[PDB]
Amino acid sequence: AVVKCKPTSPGRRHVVKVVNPELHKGKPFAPLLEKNSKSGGRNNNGRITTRHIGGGHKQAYRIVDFKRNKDGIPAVVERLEYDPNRSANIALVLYKDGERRYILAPKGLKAGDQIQSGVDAAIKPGNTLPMRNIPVGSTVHNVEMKPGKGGQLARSAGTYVQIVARDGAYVTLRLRSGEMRKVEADCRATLGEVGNAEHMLRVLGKAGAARWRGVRPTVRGTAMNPVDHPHGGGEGRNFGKHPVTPWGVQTKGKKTRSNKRTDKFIVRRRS
Amino acid sequence: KFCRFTAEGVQEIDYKDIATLKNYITESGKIVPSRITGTRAKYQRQLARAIKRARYLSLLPYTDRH
């Protein structure tokens, strides 16, 4: 549900929460947890290489099965869980042989539901199949780019991919970006859309909530001095320049993709 | 005029009966008006539904130019 907060303080007035009563209220499944300490956006030279990253809440990493390789063994959804590491919720599934795993939670999936993977799985949300065994036109998520590599496409909340065509060894996919791309038909996909589609309706409401997610403030180039940024300077608010990055590359329209290696798989750019 | 379905006690017109339905479409494949063939309104409605069902199953053409 999308819930508006009452304006009991100015930092609460514009808050819009996404509240999901289905989500587990207890602790996560410890065997599938790992530590994940923060970076501040600094690399192994100690330098900031991605600005505006730091702070926020401590998060444990959940090991999510993106490969969905355990073929032919049915599994049952035990519960749906909050995962701090991504926008999608995740589901703890118990396979018939006693193994437990986390998967991305598709839309509609609930505790008690059965899922399966393999060439002979039924065509139902949460089931994973090679895409040569999935009807053209189907809506899928967690799509592999290479066979056996693990899902890489359409993993964010509410995202999905359409299989628009199949031709010999490849399928054509319409991605959430609008790109039409080819991947080998032996690549796996999970039926349905990723759940939590209301994720985008949330409104942070205040600076502090962004800080909680570990986002540090963005300083505008124009508010700086020339030594700091091509946009800096001026007596008062001045611009008179073509907008650029802090490193001087045009940042309104200039295209940056340069991958001749992968160009053959792009049927049509996102437009 | 005179209505061939009233004079035969037809309960339903049977989209499967292609031979009968072909007398109620034109060369272009269009449903003939009931004012031309003299069909009663009740049977004209049954006949239109039957023709459309037969068109769906490709037992009759929508047009002469497929």
């Binding site: - | 499967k16 199953l57 490709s58």
Partner: protein, 103 residues
């Protein structure tokens, strides 16, 4: 239960799978306590217009009495079966145990 008239059309190159398709579809119905009242294999026919760039298909007519759910399952089977290029499931007031104009 409800009376349904079902016509399905098979890819003419999968004509030989049709006897088995009829056997499985009637097996599901009768396993749901359903009764086949009319069954007719019309065979390959000329399409009035092309479908999937085909000009022929193998028609099968069944008049069955079945619960709704097994008919839904049969429709999902039709949808996901690449051999069945078209189908139509209609309700009927009463059971139709007769001979069609095609036979």
């Amino acid at each position: 239960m409800r009376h349904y008239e079902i016509v399905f059309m098979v890819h003419p190159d999968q004509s030989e799978q049709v006897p088995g398709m009829i056997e499985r579809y009637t097996a599901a119905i009768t396993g749901a306590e359903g009764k086949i009242h009319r069954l007719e294999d019309w065979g390959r026919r000329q399409l009035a217009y092309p479908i999937n760039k085909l000009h022929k298909a193998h028609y099968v007519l069944m008049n069955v009495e079945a619960p709704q759910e097994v008919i839904d399952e049969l429709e999902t089977t039709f949808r996901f079966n690449d051999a069945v290029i078209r189908s139509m499931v209609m309700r009927t007031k009463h059971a139709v145990t007769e001979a069609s104009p095609m036979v």
